[PDB]
Amino acid sequence: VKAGDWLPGFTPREETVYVHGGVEPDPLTGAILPPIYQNTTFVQESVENYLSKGFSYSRTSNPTVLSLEKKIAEIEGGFGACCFATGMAATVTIFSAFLAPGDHCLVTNCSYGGTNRCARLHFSKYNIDFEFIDFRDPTNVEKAIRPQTKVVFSESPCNPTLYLADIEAISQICKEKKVLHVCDSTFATPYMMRPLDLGADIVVQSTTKYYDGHNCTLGGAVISSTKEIHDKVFFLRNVMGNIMSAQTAFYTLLTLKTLPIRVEKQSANAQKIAEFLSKHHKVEHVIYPGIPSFPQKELALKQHKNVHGGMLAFEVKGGTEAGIRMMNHVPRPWSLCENLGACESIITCPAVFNMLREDRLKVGITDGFIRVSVGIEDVNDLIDGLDYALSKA
Amino acid sequence: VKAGDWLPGFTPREETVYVHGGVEPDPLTGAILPPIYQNTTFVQESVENYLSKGFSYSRTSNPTVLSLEKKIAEIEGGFGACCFATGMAATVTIFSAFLAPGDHCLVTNCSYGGTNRCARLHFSKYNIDFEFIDFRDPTNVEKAIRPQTKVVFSESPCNPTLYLADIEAISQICKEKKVLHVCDSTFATPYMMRPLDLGADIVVQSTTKYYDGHNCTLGGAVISSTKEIHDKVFFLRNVMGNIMSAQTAFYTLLTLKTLPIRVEKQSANAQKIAEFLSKHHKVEHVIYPGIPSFPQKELALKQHKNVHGGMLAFEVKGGTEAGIRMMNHVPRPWSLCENLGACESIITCPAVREDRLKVGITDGFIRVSVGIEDVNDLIDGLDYALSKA
Amino acid sequence: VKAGDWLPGFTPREETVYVHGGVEPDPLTGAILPPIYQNTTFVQESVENYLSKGFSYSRTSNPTVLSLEKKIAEIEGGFGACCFATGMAATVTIFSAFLAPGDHCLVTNCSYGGTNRCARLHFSKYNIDFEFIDFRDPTNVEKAIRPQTKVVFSESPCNPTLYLADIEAISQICKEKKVLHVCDSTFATPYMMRPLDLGADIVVQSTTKYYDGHNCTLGGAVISSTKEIHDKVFFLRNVMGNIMSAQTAFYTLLTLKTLPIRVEKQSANAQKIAEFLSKHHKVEHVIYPGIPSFPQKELALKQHKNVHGGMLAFEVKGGTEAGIRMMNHVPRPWSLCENLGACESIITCPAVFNMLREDRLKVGITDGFIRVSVGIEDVNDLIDGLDYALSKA
Amino acid sequence: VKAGDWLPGFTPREETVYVHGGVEPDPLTGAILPPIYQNTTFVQESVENYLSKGFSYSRTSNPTVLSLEKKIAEIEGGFGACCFATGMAATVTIFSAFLAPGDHCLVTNCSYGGTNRCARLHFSKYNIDFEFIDFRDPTNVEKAIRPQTKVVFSESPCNPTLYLADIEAISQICKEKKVLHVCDSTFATPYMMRPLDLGADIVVQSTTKYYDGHNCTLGGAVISSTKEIHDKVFFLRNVMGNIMSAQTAFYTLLTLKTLPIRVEKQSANAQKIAEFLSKHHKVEHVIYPGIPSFPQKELALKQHKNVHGGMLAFEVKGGTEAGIRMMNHVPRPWSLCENLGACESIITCPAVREDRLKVGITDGFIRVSVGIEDVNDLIDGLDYALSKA
Ligand SMILES: *Cc1c(COP(=O)(O)O)cnc(C)c1O
Ligand SMILES: *Cc1c(COP(=O)(O)O)cnc(C)c1O
Ligand SMILES: *Cc1c(COP(=O)(O)O)cnc(C)c1O
Ligand SMILES: *Cc1c(COP(=O)(O)O)cnc(C)c1O
């Protein structure tokens, strides 16, 4: 074994895979990072040697994007990954590939807003029936499967309610039923939970959130457990032209290296903040998978590795008015905006940042429902700011 | 009127719009170029001031992408534009927005391969009927329109045959029929043909090609004639997650500035190369709108402005094997690859299928993208290559 | 000869060199554009194979920067090129390499402000004597050469007066005198004049201006006629750590492709604008190498190929007050700012955008002296805006 | 105090400054990250409003670079910071600004190679006398100060020996002597040592190393304790044309956010690797501030905060050939290259010169940059490599 070779028969440990996975020094120059292939087209040597060097057009595939895809397939435990302009585009590509008119698709009722909206507002017009059910109980899913069900789409934890789905149990049901199991583990990251290890057929990620974790790029990823699934997604990406760009792939290859340490820090910070809010006289409920009153504590302890994540939610006593005063008074370092998973701590109120009382209520997004993405700042500053805002609420 | 203002009541001339349309110096700093908003989210000042600064999340809209969209809307003469990760995503978004199960869509039979394939192989599974017809006679279009027809999709010039479609007549037909006319004018560029000026309801562009013209970025654009259409596209883009990145948009804002002079040069070179090939004994036919042998020269002279474009095609005597030997022996500066519209001259023979000769792509059919190299190097390379055919 | 080879024994024509010079498809993937080597360090195969792949540290050299350097050396007719963070850094590196205390350096008295300032304010403290003389007459230079003269630094055309220097004649003198001839041909571009073809030893370029021509990047280049000179510059760049970045190199590799067509359009526009101003009753003098009253018309016709450039200057009747009203009233498309050579037409007043009357007068930068960089907009818009501003002056 | 404001009278804690220092949401859009001002010039509103928006030309200053400079000034506790294309340009600019013919400058004898070489081989031709001495005893510094001495240049820890300099004592010596103290704390990072807090007049940083920590960018920074010093540096940077690019500054603004957790991890790994090597029979000596065998452990415990850093060094028994065989057989995840401070673990043996052993770099001297990989992979690779020594 020489410098540049890995030791044979060794599987690199996890953090090493985050640092190096799917990437070796440039063969041509030894460049330690992958060069950015900011180019549209790739010259062919001859008609007979078409694609011999593996590339022809970046809408189809691109060397930088491919390096990122390989690293992501390694980190998530999948056969192959496909990288997309956004997480919404990865989601939409799954829905586009595996559903046809007359098909049934069970979706967690607490899915990300955008996922729900793309299902109801758009894909339903193709006479695809999306049924949104409670995924907390796996028997609910098992018995909601119909003969037209082709896809079961789980999310865990859920955006923003933080409800968990038992991925292993649902995967068990879907295998027995011969149904595709797709799971959106954006809130979890592979550091906390890898649905493909838990039996999922497909994982969808918004790399915008934690993969990036820097509020820098948009991106999506579809990680497939088999070559058939992977090739289907690959084909449809080429057709829908929603592939990720080389520059975004570079950014994400760079930010993935620190995902484990980032998520550890965010999660410790979030554990402390959730405990603080748990004791606060102005706070009505606190949802965080790591505090002992979490209603799905057992599933969390079963399913979450290392951490319980950077996301939490709470409710301020007083209702919408108090929540709004609180939001309007949360100071820096906090940011009042959308997105999550970033180094920068973010706070938002999903119910004021278009629908009706009863929907957001049945969903769990109450009127004072504040969603919180914890970053890597000093937790004492973050709690100072929350405490101030709360005294103002 | 002081420094930094456009004169009220005056309209910039064409090239000025390419340089400056949709962009002003940065209000905060005066930066002559718009900064790159390489950021995903935008901080809101309060709950009630939500969106007061115009942005929330870059998947929905981004300032750099918006400046490019304003430029493109100005260049193509439309109400609004939306920018996409690719031309194929733009096309797909039109299909997704304006078709439903049971609808009918007429598509030019000589469309870009990708368009034909996403229609026939994906959207057709939603029980959408795509009919491919010959758009060279607008009477065909008029006769083929059904009551379920929602979209007529033209492309002019066509890839790779360079067939032309009469955008104005087709638009009058669709207006009378209240059907949406979408035109893919990627091969023309707005510098030679603007379908919105000719009555098209929507324009689709692969900005990858000429807008970029540098082999650098991928991109797509949908330019909408009306606010209703543009709002629909915008909403669907947000739902599809196929918006263009801010970095890409910065690149394209940069490269658009030289589109007029780039296309002037490419078309000069293309005219010269077409005349050269028109005389070569190894060459069966030459297709370029700028030579008298062009079948649709009347429509060409009516519809094309400034130039006849950087794209041409030609047939080499001897069929597929001849074309292949030529390709294998085309020297630099030519590049054998995909893509078109670049400063780098590109040659390809898409053949290397009885529906090919129905789509007009024959055995020795060679599509040629003329760049801005010295035309003598390009012609000398072509002449050598042909000596090996 | 196969696809990917050039025809043997052919020298590619000029515009072809701008499009392709110093760049071939990526050997590894066939990528038509050079990949961006956004990386600091390059992995070595072994101790004995150190530098075998040619790179180790991007402060010293970088593959993207090297591609740009090769293209630039081709376009300018030099042995080798060295690319720098800015044009000021290239200039400073020349001054740093070839002057020592006690040395004499003749500089054109109408050099770029920054060049003059770095000479007087900084390098003079090393007891280097910079003598600034009129370069319009080559005999002035010949007879101003002293035994301590090591460097003759010409600029042509000059920023902003547009004075020309007879590069061939000065090169002749410097050869006979055994003195280094450096020429800053930023205003000219190699499309109009290549001092290395005219006998210069070194060419300095601010690639910020026309190489870029898009107001996008900063950059500098030093093109050396011999390997000795080139290696000296290379060493000193590594030591002073002012190399250009891979990303800026990519941008410039991309913008160089259109330099010929850009400069043709800018120059036609500038010829028209200079004629218009030549006829304008509010304009006192107009300087443009292309109009028939240019005082150095003969040298211009001798020395300029294809074009007379995008730069012009004029003076408004009325003095500083009229000039200021005019500047304050020039509308878009014009931009009131610094820089030049860009697609965007730019106007500025060097004498109000810190010194004294008599210096700016002896220099030629009069009080109403407006410098104009013409872009590629529609010339009718540009003349409309100038005419408006002038009616306002 | 509403959303978007810092509480008046409060000072952010350390890690918060790494995330947020010197940056606010974009006033125009609310963009949570500052846009990239990839532009050369800035449009002025009028002749008299010249510079009213703060910018004119990116060689002189640029908004992205300025936001990074504000962050860095906050992190290092200085009046101001200027950013440069590289660490070497920062060092060079200090030498250019503060030395003149006939001046004297004391420089640590175990400085980074580049610093020693730009002094001995370039600036010495301006009749500037550079004296290289042993900074481990501040009495040496005090005794070596001449009336022509203008700059004392310390570096702590030193590259590659990891010698420490007592920044506080040296600063007191230079204060009494009214000589400028510049400290290159590149190896320490402000997370472990901030020389400005210890009395240094100037800090120089290669942001290439830990500030970046990703092997991505080159960069330098000069942090000035006073406005006089900072204005001098700024003026000279404008004259030298060696400012940092806006894109680089964007990258570094990004990577700085994780510097604390990166360095925490690297130093944990480094402590474990040093303890491992301290026990290996093939290893002569191990140099890491965090083990009891460290000669300057008292100064280490006094001057280092939080961690003892990601850098270590060690000597392999058998000399140069042993070190070389080890290097040739260090496996992945290790990278054999230059640079340090990255998430990617890097190893090198700078030897492959009687002044080497005067500068303390022996035959089997191996400098090691510990990244954030799993320490077991790193130790296993080192153990194999050593089995081949
Ligand atoms: C944000 C999100 C998405 C959408 O991904 P984008 O990158 O914003 O398009 C999908 N799933 C979850 C859980 C998400 O949070
Ligand atoms: C290439 C092309 C497209 C597709 O655009 P992409 O950017 O490659 O996805 C659409 N129409 C035409 C005419 C095209 O040539
Ligand atoms: C602008 C200029 C320079 C300086 O180059 P920068 O890129 O601005 O540092 C040098 N010479 C001339 C003629 C110039 O115009
Ligand atoms: C590398 C280094 C430098 C030089 O910085 P660059 O960015 O490589 O130019 C200066 N000081 C130390 C300690 C260094 O290690």
Short mmCIF file of C-alpha atoms and ligand atoms in Angstrom, two decimals, chain A residues 40 57 59 238 241, chain B residues 85-89 91 111-115 153 155 157-159 184-187 204-209 217-220 339-340 367, ligand 2:
data_model
loop_
_atom_site.label_atom_id
_atom_site.label_comp_id
_atom_site.label_asym_id
_atom_site.label_seq_id
_atom_site.Cartn_x
_atom_site.Cartn_y
_atom_site.Cartn_z
CA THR A 40 -22.10 22.52 -20.56
CA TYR A 57 -23.94 17.06 -21.48
CA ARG A 59 -28.05 18.35 -17.99
CA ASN A 238 -32.42 14.01 -17.57
CA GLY A 241 -33.88 18.94 -16.63
CA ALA B 85 -32.27 25.24 -14.21
CA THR B 86 -32.34 24.22 -17.90
CA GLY B 87 -34.21 24.69 -21.15
CA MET B 88 -35.69 21.25 -20.64
CA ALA B 89 -37.08 22.30 -17.25
CA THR B 91 -40.31 23.13 -21.51
CA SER B 111 -38.71 19.47 -32.40
CA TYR B 112 -35.53 19.16 -30.36
CA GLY B 113 -35.07 15.52 -29.39
CA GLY B 114 -35.53 16.23 -25.69
CA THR B 115 -38.93 17.85 -26.23
CA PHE B 153 -45.77 24.08 -29.63
CA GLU B 155 -39.93 25.70 -32.77
CA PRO B 157 -35.62 27.25 -36.63
CA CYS B 158 -35.97 23.55 -35.85
CA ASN B 159 -33.27 21.43 -34.29
CA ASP B 184 -39.17 27.55 -28.80
CA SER B 185 -37.02 30.17 -30.54
CA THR B 186 -33.76 28.83 -29.10
CA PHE B 187 -32.11 28.54 -32.53
CA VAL B 204 -39.36 29.04 -24.28
CA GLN B 205 -35.58 29.39 -24.47
CA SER B 206 -32.68 27.17 -23.60
CA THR B 207 -30.39 29.90 -22.29
CA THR B 208 -27.71 27.19 -22.35
CA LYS B 209 -27.22 27.82 -26.06
CA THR B 217 -24.01 27.31 -17.90
CA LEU B 218 -27.25 25.43 -18.26
CA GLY B 219 -30.44 27.43 -18.18
CA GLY B 220 -34.01 27.83 -19.36
CA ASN B 339 -24.64 21.83 -27.48
CA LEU B 340 -24.74 24.74 -29.92
CA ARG B 367 -25.59 19.71 -37.72
C1 LIG E 2 -31.31 21.95 -26.11
C2 LIG E 2 -32.72 22.46 -26.39
C3 LIG E 2 -33.50 22.46 -25.55
C4 LIG E 2 -33.18 21.92 -24.14
O1 LIG E 2 -32.49 22.88 -23.39
P1 LIG E 2 -31.42 22.37 -22.25
O2 LIG E 2 -30.80 23.56 -21.57
O3 LIG E 2 -30.35 21.54 -22.90
O4 LIG E 2 -32.10 21.52 -21.21
C5 LIG E 2 -34.79 22.94 -25.82
N1 LIG E 2 -35.03 23.44 -27.22
C6 LIG E 2 -34.03 23.38 -28.10
C7 LIG E 2 -34.25 23.88 -29.54
C8 LIG E 2 -33.02 22.97 -27.77
O5 LIG E 2 -31.98 22.92 -28.71
#
